[PDB]
Design an enzyme around this catalytic site. Structure first.
Site, PDB file in Angstrom:
ATOM      1  N   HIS B 136     148.161 -20.950 -39.882  1.00 24.18           N
ATOM      2  CA  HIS B 136     149.343 -20.633 -40.656  1.00 24.18           C
ATOM      3  C   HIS B 136     150.483 -20.137 -39.752  1.00 24.18           C
ATOM      4  O   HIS B 136     150.281 -19.469 -38.763  1.00 24.18           O
ATOM      5  CB  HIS B 136     148.997 -19.575 -41.726  1.00 24.18           C
ATOM      6  CG  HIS B 136     148.429 -18.294 -41.209  1.00 24.18           C
ATOM      7  ND1 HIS B 136     149.206 -17.201 -40.858  1.00 24.18           N
ATOM      8  CD2 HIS B 136     147.152 -17.923 -40.953  1.00 24.18           C
ATOM      9  CE1 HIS B 136     148.388 -16.260 -40.419  1.00 24.18           C
ATOM     10  NE2 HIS B 136     147.127 -16.650 -40.454  1.00 24.18           N
ATOM     11  N   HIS B 145     152.925 -31.191 -27.250  1.00 19.36           N
ATOM     12  CA  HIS B 145     151.647 -31.904 -27.384  1.00 19.36           C
ATOM     13  C   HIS B 145     150.533 -30.880 -27.432  1.00 19.36           C
ATOM     14  O   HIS B 145     150.292 -30.173 -26.451  1.00 19.36           O
ATOM     15  CB  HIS B 145     151.447 -32.885 -26.235  1.00 19.36           C
ATOM     16  CG  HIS B 145     150.156 -33.650 -26.294  1.00 19.36           C
ATOM     17  ND1 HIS B 145     149.746 -34.419 -25.240  1.00 19.36           N
ATOM     18  CD2 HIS B 145     149.161 -33.780 -27.209  1.00 19.36           C
ATOM     19  CE1 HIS B 145     148.577 -34.962 -25.565  1.00 19.36           C
ATOM     20  NE2 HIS B 145     148.172 -34.619 -26.740  1.00 19.36           N
TER      21      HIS B 145
END
Ligand SMILES: [Cl-]
Ligand SMILES: [Cl-]
Ligand SMILES: [Cl-]
Ligand SMILES: [Cl-]
Ligand SMILES: [Cl-]
Ligand SMILES: [Cl-]
Ligand SMILES: [Cl-]
Ligand SMILES: [Cl-]
Ligand SMILES: [Cl-]
Lengths: 207, 207, 207
Positions: B136, B145
């Site tokens: 979250h 990446h």
């Protein structure tokens, strides 16, 4: 030995077998019977030891899975099962993601939560255990074992009977020899020869 | 250059492209063509190098994905594609779990087995690679990446073009600067500045 | 306090609650209200602090989840909720794979991407966080927390209120005591007693 018509025979009745049984059942397969060197597992009867295999074949069972974690032993039992006329099925949990360009062998276990990406080749009797990741262009030798939550980052070659412990990682392009063990959590950053043990971050061969 | 009507053009024809192609096809999309600096990939024709982009646009193709792993180059090619009139699609494997409160940019790759939780923001051209976890309240900058099997434990900010190797982990609340590399398996327990390399458990900057 | 008929009450309104809310909604459940010590979260109203629980029960709400990451506090609030007449639901994301032989307690969170294999037992108020793997024959004590991307390799026992950080790993057969913390990325290769902190690859107790 009174058995239904048509299910899968399992060699081995331990913890690995439990997981395999559940993968098969999740796909709608029926597990007929277990043969175990100690002659039920999640409701599947243990009908004898490996000397029961001819009798199982004679009664029409012809599909088999080798649920033995030890790589060398699994490989030997797969040969024995095939000599007795069984075909080795795959036990692939429905939640596993197997790319359409993956080549699979026979007798392969692929547990829940696995992902296997493009153009990877998976040898006979491999285990790709729970949550493991096999990225693109990997080559997994016969009877190797990628342990739970392990990850290969693409272009990795894993030799026959090699074993990667829980959470092991391999960076792109690395080759790991046959019969090598990577300890739990090992991070392999260089090629490993055959028949070694490597541990650590980064993984180092231990004499 | 004889192509169907309507699919997605891919910039790049390497290993990353293979995985992206398979994500798109798993969603029912069609891949029209590849442009590659070396002028087929899983059956998709390579029609030229980037000088072919105007011609592709002229013939009615307008949807594109940049399948280039190098973050800085991907970012530059995404700009070039947009200047040529292409819209950048997302390539999100159907097995990925993307929370309904996640904000996604454009040109984002989300591989098989990923989970992205509540109120995370994913910048344009990010890669969230196979099996990665984004908990979250994360903030992922453009063209970063998160490598295969990496995990961010919530409230983590990742700068533009940063790269987390296979199996990297970041504890809650950490900020990682732009252009930083975390090695495979690195466990980041403190904020990292821009333009550094960090490796180890715990991760340490390497001069 | 004007609320619909029938949903789930949540104790806690922080980041963990966001993820739990989304798990519940992904299953088709309705979240009625939050009680929070600071007296909306993803659209769920915060109606008061824990002194509002009797009023919620009186108006017919009887289902509750404790969305508090702190293990000891979660455990205490679960007891309080049950004393007030609430039943503790589970919040299991639909993408989680929970074997049919797993025993689940009550008030358990199981996040996206989790896999839990055969004959594992999950105590009340446990958290099995995003992407975590629980292999066969594990025993998870009440109110423990397996953090995101953590992995237990089978036959592992985790004591009450123990906490495994992001990406922690435990090899087969290990027992971890109550109230113990394994740091992010820790690789546990030997039993841990109660009330210790262990970090590293391999994990070592830190005084
Ligand atoms: Cl069965
Ligand atoms: Cl196998
Ligand atoms: Cl070495
Ligand atoms: Cl196509
Ligand atoms: Cl991307
Ligand atoms: Cl440092
Ligand atoms: Cl709701
Ligand atoms: Cl819980
Ligand atoms: Cl120690």
């Amino acid at each position: 030995a009174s058995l239904a018509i048509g299910g899968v025979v399992i060699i081995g009745g331990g913890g690995h077998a439990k997981v395999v049984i559940e993968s098969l059942r999740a796909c709608g397969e029926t597990v007929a019977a277990i043969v175990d060197a100690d002659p039920a597992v999640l409701g599947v009867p243990v009908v004898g030891d490996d000397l029961a295999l001819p009798m199982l074949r004679e009664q029409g069972l012809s599909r088999l899975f080798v649920a033995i974690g030890d790589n060398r032993l699994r490989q030997k039992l797969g040969r024995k099962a095939r000599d007795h006329g069984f075909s080795l099925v795959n036990a692939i949990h429905p939640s596993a993601v197997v790319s359409p360009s993956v080549r699979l062998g026979e007798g392969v276990a692929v547990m829940a939560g696995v992902a296997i990406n493009a153009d990877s080749w998976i040898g006979d009797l491999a285990i790709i255990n729970t949550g493991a990741v096999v990225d693109h262009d990997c080559r997994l030798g016969a009877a190797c074992h990628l342990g739970p939550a392990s990850a290969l980052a693409g272009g990795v070659s894993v030799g026959e009977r090699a074993f990667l412990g829980v959470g092991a990682r391999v960076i792109p392009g690395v080759t790991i020899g046959a019969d090598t063990i990577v300890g739990a959590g090992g991070v392999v950053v260089r090629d490993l020869p055959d028949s070694v043990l490597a541990i650590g971050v980064p993984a180092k061969i231990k004499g």
